[PDB]
Symmetry: C2
Subunit: 439 residues, 2 copies
């Protein structure tokens, strides 16, 4: 096959993407060993769905797992009556998700389970895939002539040829695995044929962070979770928290081999020690550095010029309300709270009005990083930790370090009941989720 | 003094730059040895004059040389009755140049002798300095916060503590020297204090070319000879032919020492050999690589973003005439021709009309590179060698390799008699110059 493994793509045909997926335990070869994973479509990652605005998606999910499951269309501003976080598909049953892709949309999205209390083991076991909304902007020459690749960043740990079970400490920290994979492959080689790459990046890990840096190169950020930036932004490294996506251009500068690495990053995960008195929680400290892939540049590379502009960011109406959502932890209990409460699917926490704009101030009063996710309603990050964000783009996950406040501008789009939650999915399963109702 | 030597600057005061310079033989220390040079203002290079649009310049040149001399205000679109290539200032006499800096002007210019038949030894001996027209564009933050430096690139050879005399081969090739200097200094160190540098580059050499490359970095071209580009242009190297200027931004990428080099370049200079039959002319081949300066980056450099735009290039009226000027050589005679003739100050070669636009096709039918210069009327290079130029900017020198045609758009500005000539100044002295009259 290709040097660079990527999930097989399913494209809409004549404006319709009609597909039956099964969620199933699946023997496969991964990272050179046999294992049984839980997969969509028989593969890990699941197939990449590639659509355009105004396409119809008709996805029938057949549940062949021994437990109930459902799908969250992560990042898509569609109705929560379709992207329904409360729906349960029992074992052996099927459900058809049907929606129209919004007109004003572009970027990399993804799909995964969202059945409260079961997300973390289902996602860890292999249930996830990408969705790409292709744009008329992809025809500008500076993007069309780039070599495009999707990188699904997701780690795994195997025990007995199956995903390793969750321990108590995994429920507290979020589970990370020792196999740090790209598109299900261990440290693949990307032999570039063009001097400009356009990389779609997805962090589909339960809890692992990827502090991305390409040796000897900057990255040019051109899209965040839910859409393009207004113009490319040069960065020396890019932190992708669980659930985040980004698209970057890479402008290869000379022949050679360059490592794409996940550089050491301390997200506040905790261990336990006993030193005589004790036992007490102690910080795990930074992650060990990981090589994600080997990038081989072509001979005599001469990258394209960068595009001068991408997409203008919408002018939003003035906001009508300011919310404040405070995140806290009880680590030894592995319990996690928003404004002092755990999730209750019967309780509405916030009630807002469709087509108004809200300011949400999300404050992390814990010691771990928490990546905050809001379904259905993409947002503009104004500032985090008191620092203004350096670009305007739609996001749907924002990472908060310990102590930091994020200020978000949140246009409320579709009516209905939806959720917001930490995207360290163990923390959502353990209570860090609340209910927004839009009317 | 500073780590980085630069010529002392004289600024206009209250809109007036009024200065008396003397052209004089001057004992000085240069490159660690004593020598007597010919200088303006007692220094090598001469002082940098720094003015703004609509300033008055009143420059009295006192000739203290044993031969006549004059000044050419290289690149300034002023009247040829001021920038007068036929004027002679006898030994011991003085002349006052007085002009107003044009409103729509910015960049790096320079001044040097232009007395036909004596330019090459006078310029080689040290008579040159820079003129900077500062712009309201210099206040945009991406330029204002950059560290600015002028680099006058000019080589020298010394014999007996004086500039080495011209040999016959020097008149054929143009004279190059073994001391390859920046601002009169041998391989200075530039210890950068900011992460973004704005370097004004001037090739004031008689004949040496500088194929410029900074180790491990691109250069961002922001101005050509006579004005800004429309937006910055990333280049991996930049060839500066005699008389050319450029301004580049340098975005320092990491701590360390980086060489600015003049990389090997073959301009077609010729030597002589005798191998049994013979003696016959033989190519000298490429120049040896030279280190121009050592650039030390600061700690933890974080360059500014590049400016998105600089200056829009004027929309020019449609042209009313196409000229064709063919350059040829008689190397063994050291004679050089345009359309088959040598310069004659009494003969008008071209007659054009003020405020019309002309297309000039300049064709190098020789084997050497020839950098073609037009006084008084800056031009837009459309293409050279059949390749479209990748930016729009005012130029006044265009380099032609052997066989190449340059197509130039030439708006005729001030009325009067002026000249065009090769800026390998030995070739101008030996006849490669003609007369344009604008009415
Ligand atoms: Cu998600
Ligand atoms: Cu969390
Ligand atoms: Cu969710
Ligand atoms: Cu000149
Ligand atoms: Cu010439
Ligand atoms: Cu001249
Ligand atoms: Na299957
Ligand atoms: Na003097």
């Amino acid at each position: 096959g290709p040097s660079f493994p990527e999930p097989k793509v399913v494209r809409s045909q004549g404006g319709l993407l009609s597909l039956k997926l099964s969620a199933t335990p699946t023997p496969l070869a991964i990272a050179g060993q046999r294992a049984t994973l839980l997969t969509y479509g028989g593969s890990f990652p699941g197939p990449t769905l590639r659509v355009r605005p105004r396409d119809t998606v008709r996805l029938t999910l057949e549940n062949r797992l021994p437990e109930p499951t459902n799908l969250h269309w992560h990042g898509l501003p569609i109705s929560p009556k379709v992207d329904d976080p409360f729906l349960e598909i029992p074992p052996g049953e099927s459900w058809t998700y049907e929606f129209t892709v919004p007109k004003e949309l572009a970027g990399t999205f993804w799909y995964h389970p969202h059945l409260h209390g079961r997300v973390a083991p289902q996602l860890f076991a292999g249930l996830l895939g990408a969705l790409v909304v292709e744009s008329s902007l992809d025809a500008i020459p500076e993007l069309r002539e780039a070599e495009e690749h999707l990188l699904v960043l997701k780690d795994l740990a195997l025990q007995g040829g199956r995903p390793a079970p969750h321990t108590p400490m995994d429920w507290m920290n979020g589970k990370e695995g020792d196999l740090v994979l790209v598109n299900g492959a261990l440290r693949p080689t990307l032999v570039a044929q063009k001097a400009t790459l356009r990389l779609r990046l997805l962090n589909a890990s339960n809890a692992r962070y990827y502090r991305l840096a390409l040796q000897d190169h900057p990255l040019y950020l051109i899209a965040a979770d839910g859409g393009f930036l207004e113009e490319p932004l040069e960065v020396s490294e890019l932190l992708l928290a669980p659930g985040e996506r980004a698209e970057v251009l890479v402008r290869l500068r000379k022949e050679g081999r360059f490592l794409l690495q996940a550089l050491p990053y301390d997200r506040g995960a905790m261990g336990m020690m006993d030193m005589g008195g004790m036992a007490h929680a102690m910080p795990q400290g930074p992650s060990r550095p990981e090589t994600l892939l080997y990038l081989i540049a072509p001979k005599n590379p001469k990258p394209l010029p960068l595009p001068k502009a991408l997409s203008p960011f919408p002018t939003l109406p003035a906001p009508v309300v300011t919310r404040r959502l405070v995140l806290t932890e009880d680590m030894m209990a592995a319990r996690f709270f928003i404004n002092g409460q755990v999730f209750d699917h019967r309780r509405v926490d916030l009630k807002g009005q469709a087509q108004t704009v809200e300011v949400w101030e999300v404050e992390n009063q814990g010691d771990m990083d928490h990546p905050f996710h809001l379904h259905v309603h993409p947002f503009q990050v104004l500032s985090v930790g008191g620092r203004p964000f350096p670009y305007r783009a739609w996001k749907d996950v924002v990472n908060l370090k310990a102590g930091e406040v994020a200020r978000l501008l949140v246009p409320l789009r579709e009516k209905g009941r939806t959720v917001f939650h930490c995207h360290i999915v163990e923390h959502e399963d353990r209570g860090m989720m609340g209910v927004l109702e839009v009317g």
